[PDB]
């Protein structure tokens, strides 16, 4: 037991859901502007001060405001047999502002593998960083 | 960004109805004050109010926690109202759900921390999430 799991961080953001989805989507594809007009790509990042690399297949779905990253190889694969990251944006139930959900769906390589709390804080911080460019 | 939710979900090998009973029993039962069981008025324990004593990253900690459950959804809720955990949060509720896998053998256990920060400089509860994750691991390793 304990090899298959999911970590989620969900944040409320005072921004329309479709607009925030467009900003997240554009930020990941490139950014001079905040908005822009399958796909395998390199993913280079710094995780708690350590530079890392990955290859990921990405998809997006505009109607559900969902970005998906399926990591196929790289530093994350040292601990995981499977590592998928999903970002979803949805309106708050009232309609003023939105809820942003980052999910990491993972399968550990073995029992001594960590669960990806370090990646969760990393993606959480991405939401915070982008939210900071939005005025209240 | 003051309102959010952190979630850890883990597949374990125990049966869902059994795992729910064990969690529920551990949380509804030597302390500083004597915990109390509560009832809705039918000869059934509906919950408990008690001291939660725990160690979080080296520091001993304490809180007042009220537990409620819903045997039908196999859902348990920890409602924390004062103590160490309330130093960063205006709201801190922990929801534990246990559901069978599709094949019916083993289950999926979900801990969700529903939190509201005091201000923007408050951390999100990643330390608590790792603590609760290890509790799932520890509990299942004890169940045959």
Residue numbers in the entry:
A (entry chain B): 7 to 36, 41 to 47, 58 to 156
B (entry chain A): 8 to 36, 41 to 155
Which of the paper's sentences describe this entry?
The contiguous latex includes an abundance of related proteins belonging to the pathogenesis-related (PR)10 family known collectively as major latex proteins (MLPs) and representing at least 35% of the total cellular protein content. Members of the pathogenesis-related (PR)10 family, also known as Bet v 1 or major latex proteins (MLPs), belong to the wider ‘StARkin’ lipid-transfer protein (LTP) classification with diverse physiological roles in plants, including sterol trafficking, lipid ‘sensor’ activity, and modulation of transcription factor function. Using a combination of sucrose density-gradient fractionation-coupled proteomics, differential scanning fluorimetry, isothermal titration calorimetry, and X-ray crystallography, we show that the major latex proteins are a family of alkaloid-binding proteins that display altered conformation in the presence of certain ligands. Seven antiparallel β-strands cradle the C-terminal α-helix with the alkaloid binding pocket located in a hydrophobic pocket between the central C-terminal α-helix and the β-sheet.
In the absence of a bound alkaloid, W63 rotates to occupy the hydrophobic binding pocket. Alkaloid binding leads to the ordering of β2 completing the Bet v 1-fold. Alkaloid binding and subsequent ordering of the β2 strand causes C59 to be buried. S-S bonding is potentially a key factor in the ability of opium poppy latex proteins to bind alkaloids and form dense aggregates.
